[PDB]
């Protein structure tokens, strides 16, 4: 049993699809249930906490708002009491564009500063129409709310989930409702889990950079461009070394190479001086791949991953399985792609979100990137479940 003391608007997106009913008379129950085990999880939900459920399916019906019940037993109540309408369409879309814009607005409860807005969606299919919910999902995270997914069952798309998510590893999924409440742990750590944009904190930062030939192709200036990118991402940090943010640097060709390791320097002049020093292959590969895998093994408080990239990977190391086995240490992954020459599927593939994927036409326009990628890199999340 896992508790969380943050104080929280949480927002549970509850499927009433026929589909759930279909499958199982019980299958409503269980969901239930389980929504009624994370309102026992917040130990602030009474006081001060608050919880609202949202139906989606055809449509969407606000079971109740933020703002309705005021303790625990009397929101469980509420939980027990919805009817579910065994609609027709999976709405995923249309369920998160009504989160936004009414079940975190000031008249159903929401607003207060002080908490931090978490939405927790259920579904056991993949969106089949209504507002796409990729833009929903981004409209709705720029808001400040952390988006937790749960699939059930076969008949949802886990790439679909990862897009509306919050990151990766906050899309959890089961075979059936039966089990819905083996993820009853892991949903609260995730609930619990705050991030905040911090330059300050502690945090270990790795660099995997493009070092290929192809850079300076038909531009010789390119590389220096992409190092002054990374140094300037560098003067953003208010300290580095052992007290503050450490500084890696691997760079891949046809394979990857450890300039630097987190513990190499602790200043910002040697840093940016080490940066500097980094010289280009004479081979024209991009080892992705390899790259993932050496800061994994070599390189590695807050863990972030900048890659960058102007070509495709070559196979050597697959860079699906590497950022997997990083992101599952905790390494935010960030990806940039340069040029006309990379695939933004893998770009995609290893990010820690999509929304961490930037791209630009050219290494002179990396500056329209900056501010975005930096807010990325001083990242700064914190697990405050506990038991």
Same mark, same amino acid.
Do not use: W
């Given at each position: 049993?896992?508790?969380?003391?943050?104080?929280?608007?949480?927002?549970?997106?509850?499927?009433?699809?026929?589909?759930?009913?279909?499958?199982?008379?019980?299958?409503?129950?269980?969901?239930?249930?389980?929504?009624?085990?994370?309102?026992?999880?917040?130990?602030?939900?009474?006081?001060?906490?608050?919880?609202?459920?949202?139906?989606?399916?055809?449509?969407?019906?606000?079971?109740?708002?933020?703002?309705?019940?005021?303790?625990?037993?009397?929101?469980?109540?509420?939980?027990?009491?919805?009817?579910?309408?065994?609609?027709?369409?999976?709405?995923?879309?249309?369920?998160?564009?009504?989160?936004?814009?009414?079940?975190?607005?000031?008249?159903?409860?929401?607003?207060?500063?002080?908490?931090?807005?978490?939405?927790?969606?259920?579904?056991?299919?993949?969106?089949?129409?209504?507002?796409?919910?990729?833009?929903?999902?981004?409209?709705?995270?720029?808001?400040?709310?952390?988006?937790?997914?749960?699939? +059930? %069952?076969? *008949?949802?798309?886990?790439?679909? @989930? $990862?897009?509306?998510?919050?990151?990766?590893?906050?899309? !959890? &999924?089961?075979?059936?409702?039966?089990?819905?409440?083996?993820?009853?742990?892991?949903?609260?750590?995730?609930?619990?889990?705050?991030?905040?944009?911090?330059?300050?904190?502690?945090?270990?930062?790795?660099?995997?950079?493009?070092?290929?030939?192809?850079?300076?192709?038909?531009?010789?200036?390119?590389?220096?461009?992409?190092?002054?990118?990374?140094?300037?991402?560098?003067?953003?940090?208010?300290?580095?070394?052992?007290?503050?943010?450490?500084?890696?640097?691997?760079?891949?060709?046809?394979?990857?190479?450890?300039?630097?390791?987190?513990?190499?320097?602790?200043?910002?002049?040697?840093?940016?001086?080490?940066?500097?020093?980094?010289?280009?292959?004479?081979?024209?590969?991009?080892? +992705? %791949?390899? *790259?993932?895998?050496?800061?994994? @093994? $070599?390189?590695?408080?807050?863990?972030?991953?900048?890659? !960058? &990239?102007?070509?495709?990977?070559?196979?050597?190391?697959?860079?699906?399985?590497?950022?997997?086995?990083?992101?599952?240490?905790?390494?935010?992954?960030?990806?940039?792609?340069?040029?006309?020459?990379?695939?933004?599927?893998?770009?995609?593939?290893?990010?820690?979100?999509?929304?961490?994927?930037?791209?630009?036409?050219?290494?002179?326009?990396?500056?329209?990137?900056?501010?975005?990628?930096?807010?990325?890199?001083?990242?700064?999340?914190?697990?405050?479940?506990?038991?």
């Amino acid at each position: 049993a896992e508790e969380c003391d943050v104080q929280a608007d949480i927002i549970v997106l509850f499927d009433d699809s026929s589909s759930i009913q279909y499958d199982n008379k019980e299958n409503y129950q269980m969901m239930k249930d389980f929504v009624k085990e994370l309102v026992d999880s917040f130990t602030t939900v009474g006081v001060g906490s608050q919880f609202g459920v949202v139906q989606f399916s055809q449509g969407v019906k606000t079971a109740f708002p933020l703002n309705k019940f005021k303790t625990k037993e009397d929101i469980k109540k509420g939980i027990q009491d919805m009817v579910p309408r065994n609609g027709g369409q999976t709405e995923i879309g249309t369920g998160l564009k009504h989160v936004r814009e009414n079940s975190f607005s000031g008249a159903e409860g929401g607003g207060n500063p002080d908490k931090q807005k978490i939405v927790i969606l259920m579904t056991d299919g993949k969106s089949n129409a209504g507002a796409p919910p990729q833009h929903e999902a981004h409209k709705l995270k720029a808001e400040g709310v952390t988006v937790i997914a749960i699939g +059930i %069952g076969q *008949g949802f798309v886990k790439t679909e @989930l $990862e897009q509306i998510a919050t990151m990766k590893n906050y899309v !959890l &999924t089961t075979n059936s409702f039966s089990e819905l409440s083996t993820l009853l742990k892991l949903v609260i750590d995730l609930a619990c889990e705050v991030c905040v944009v911090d330059c300050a904190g502690h945090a270990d930062i790795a660099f995997v950079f493009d070092a290929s030939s192809s850079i300076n192709a038909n531009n010789p200036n390119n590389y220096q461009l992409m190092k002054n990118f990374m140094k300037d991402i560098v003067d953003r940090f208010n300290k580095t070394g052992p007290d503050g943010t450490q500084f890696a640097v691997v760079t891949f060709a046809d394979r990857a190479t450890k300039q630097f390791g987190l513990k190499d320097y602790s200043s910002k002049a040697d840093i940016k001086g080490a940066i500097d020093k980094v010289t280009p292959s004479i081979i024209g590969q991009t080892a +992705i %791949g390899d *790259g993932l895998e050496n800061a994994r @093994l $070599e390189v590695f408080v807050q863990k972030v991953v900048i890659l !960058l &990239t102007d070509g495709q990977n070559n196979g050597h190391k697959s860079p699906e399985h590497e950022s997997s086995l990083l992101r599952k240490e905790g390494v935010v992954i960030v990806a940039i792609g340069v040029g006309t020459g990379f695939l933004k599927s893998e770009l995609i593939n290893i990010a820690s979100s999509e929304e961490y994927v930037f791209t630009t036409s050219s290494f002179d326009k990396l500056s329209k990137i900056m501010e975005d990628v930096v807010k990325l890199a001083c990242m700064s999340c914190k697990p405050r479940a506990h038991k």
